[PDB]
Structure formats: C-alpha cells, structure tokens
C-alpha cells in the first residue's frame, strides 16, 4: 500500500484517475503567444478561459484542490483547452489544448455580480485562468468543489444585498435559489451550507478584506461549529 | 441615443443608453454610475479586441444592440 | 538589423541586434529598454521557446522577425 510522494494518494487504490490529454497539447508558455488568445501595463496579467480542464500532481494523478494540497505547498499542475476571456461556449472546440499549466500559486472565487455563473480562477506565475467546464474524466472530483463555489456566491451576494438579514432568511434564500444544471442537484438544503460552514465563512472574510459583524454571519458561525 | 448591452463573465447584463459618438471612457463612467464599479478596474472588449479609452463607438463599429464584454481587474489578497 | 518583440500586453519593442548575439544577450538587450530582468523573460518564436545558449542565427531568425515575449511574474 504505497502513497504518492506528491499527493499522498494510494497507487493500488482504484478510482485513481491518471490525467489524459491530446497529443496536440503544448506547454503553458507556447499557448500564451497563440494569436487566437490575443485581444490586442506589465502589472496587468493575461486572463483567459480554460474549459474541459483537469488538475493533477507532478506524477499525473488527478487531484482535488479542496484537500489542501496547495496549502501544503504541493505543486499542482492543470491542463485543458484555453479560450479567449470573452467566450461563453464551454465546448473544447474553438479552444487551444494545453498541458502542464502552473503550478497553481492560488485559486480564487470571482463574480459576485448577481449573475448566473460563479467564477473559479487559477493564478499561475505566467497568467490567470478563469475555469469553465471540467473534463469528462475530472467531473467526479470537481463535483463536491462546485457546491462550495456557488454556495459561497449565494452567501456573499445575499449579505451584500441584505446586510441585516437573519440566519433563517439565509437558509431560505439558499433553499429558494435554484441550483444550476452544472451542479446536477435538484435543490439546496441547510445541509448544503452546514457541510461547508468553515469554508463559507473563510470566503466571506476574504471578500471583506479585499476592499463580518452581521447577525446572520454570527449566528451562522456559532451554530457553524467554526 | 442608442441602446447597448454590457455582459460580464458571470452572465449579468447591463443596459446602457449611449450615443455612437460617445467614447469608451464614457461607457466605463456609465458602468460606474449603474453598477458602482470603478472605471480603473474595467476593461471593455468588442469583436475580440480590448477597446482603448481614447476611441469612440463609431470607430469600432459598435452598432445598436451590440454586446460589450466587461472583464474586471479584480482586487484580491 | 532591426527585430521586434511583441508583448502579451500588445506592446511592440524595436531592437537592433546582430545574428551573432545570443538569446541570453537578446534578453540582455530587452532589459535596458524596458527594465525587466532576463530571468523573468520567456522568448517564443514560431511556437518554439528560445533557449539561452543559442543565437538568432541558430533559429534561422532572419531580419525583421517578431519575437513574442512572455514574462514570469516577480514572485512564487
């Protein structure tokens, strides 16, 4: 029973998925110079969309990014078909395949517009990437992650719009809000929030620092167990 | 007197009443008055190219009902 | 000969250089004009990453060719 030296994952264990990518794929530096990703300060950094994506360690093992492998300072790479930042089609066609992006310095949740989508973003030492759809081989690992992303958006957007709202009103708003089809869920429950109570609070805290005395926030945190 | 849309990366749509002679900085300033977003954080893209603040909508052939894509330089820690 | 350098921001840099100069010298020629250390520079031509130990004559880089510059961010 031997683990991976990088992601501490058992090699003998089934359900362990090794990443797969087309031979067409190229390294990260070569993609950023592709004219189809050009939209034309040095402090300003490139930002593209990346669909059909998959995250993996140096040994090729598909890895989750919740587990704390990034906080543990394990170098996590990722792959997919890069697209211009303004495209909405999550289909791989029209996008340029890429291999071994990264490593991931930081992953962040964007988009608190009130719009339909929640935005996931990867920061590399060369460019920024707004993720779209996970590859059909990486969907099971990204499934649990997708709820945390959207639940955090629901909370942050509802707090910004209703700063004096209660914790009971927050459960209603979450439960009333219809989950997108990408989540493959029929409805949100109070369990959907209690499962990631530590995560939601840490997201709202980071949102306030970028630019938490609300009673619902409090009531939540005391009943959150965190 | 023209109606144009501005679409964010989350899918949110903002409707603006502009003139074909108005500049991109006027569009950014209009976005600030409606969604409260500072213009310095704003980047506008049309037909796959980022619009320069010094040019007008007639220069980029931004016709009525054209959709502008708004990308934002996010503040993060 | 004059050679251009296209940045990801769309900025174009005009450099005068000899085919005998190396990519490490090509990056050294870029620093003086814009103030970017060579370690942060990544040079791409025709979809191929220019290694430091070679010259422009090595990659058949004729006159009036356009190199594409990618920058590695300061930290991480």
């Amino acid at each position: 029973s031997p683990k991976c030296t990088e992601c501490l994952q058992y090699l003998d264990d089934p359900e362990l998925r090794y990443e797969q990518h087309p031979p067409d794929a190229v390294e990260e530096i070569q993609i950023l110079t592709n004219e189809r990703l050009s939209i034309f300060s040095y402090e300003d950094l490139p930002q593209h969309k990346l669909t059909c994506f998959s995250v993996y360690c140096k040994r090729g093992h598909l890895c989750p990014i919740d587990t704390g492998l990034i906080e543990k300072d394990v170098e996590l790479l990722f792959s997919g078909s890069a697209k211009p930042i303004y495209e909405d089609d999550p289909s791989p066609e029209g996008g340029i395949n890429g291999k071994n992006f990264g490593p991931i310095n930081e992953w962040w949740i964007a988009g608190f517009d009130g719009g339909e989508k929640a935005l996931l973003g990867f920061s590399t030492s060369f460019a920024e990437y707004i993720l779209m759809d996970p590859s059909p081989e990486y969907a099971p690992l990204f499934s649990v992650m997708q709820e945390k992303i959207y639940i955090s958006k629901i909370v942050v957007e509802f707090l910004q719009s209703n700063p004096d709202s209660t914790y009971e009103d927050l459960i209603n708003k979450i439960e009333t809000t219809v989950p997108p089809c990408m989540l493959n869920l029929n409805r949100f429950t109070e369990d959907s929030l209690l499962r990631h109570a530590q995560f939601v609070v840490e997201q709202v805290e980071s949102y306030d620092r970028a630019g938490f005395l609300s009673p619902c926030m409090r009531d939540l945190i005391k009943l959150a167990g965190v | 007197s023209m109606q144009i849309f501005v679409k964010t990366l989350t899918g949110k749509t903002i409707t603006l009443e502009v003139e074909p002679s108005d500049t991109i900085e006027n569009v950014k300033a209009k976005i600030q008055d409606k969604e409260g977003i500072p213009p310095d954080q704003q980047r506008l893209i049309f037909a796959g190219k980022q619009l320069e603040d010094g040019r007008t909508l007639s220069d980029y052939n931004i016709q009525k009902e054209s959709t502008l894509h708004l990308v934002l330089r996010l503040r993060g820690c | 000969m004059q050679i251009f350098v296209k940045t990801l921001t769309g900025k174009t840099i005009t450099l005068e250089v000899e085919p005998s100069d190396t990519i490490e010298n090509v990056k050294a020629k870029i620093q003086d004009k814009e103030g970017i250390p060579p370690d942060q520079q990544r040079l791409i031509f025709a979809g191929k990453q220019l290694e430091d130990g070679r010259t422009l004559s090595d990659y058949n880089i004729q006159k009036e060719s356009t190199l594409h510059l990618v920058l590695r961010l300061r930290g991480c």
């Binding site: 990034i70 906080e71 709202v204 970028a210 | 954080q41 503040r75 | -």
Partner: peptide
C-alpha cells in the same frame, strides 16, 4: 452615490507566495 469595487475571495494560496 456609493461605489462598490470588484473583488475575489482567496480559496487557496501556496506558502511560497508572500
């Protein structure tokens, strides 16, 4: 008229980044 900045929340960050 109030003005609201565009923001993102930090989900994870490598220790080497400081």
């Amino acid at each position: 008229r109030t003005k609201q900045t565009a923001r993102k929340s930090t989900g994870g960050k490598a220790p080497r980044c400081q």
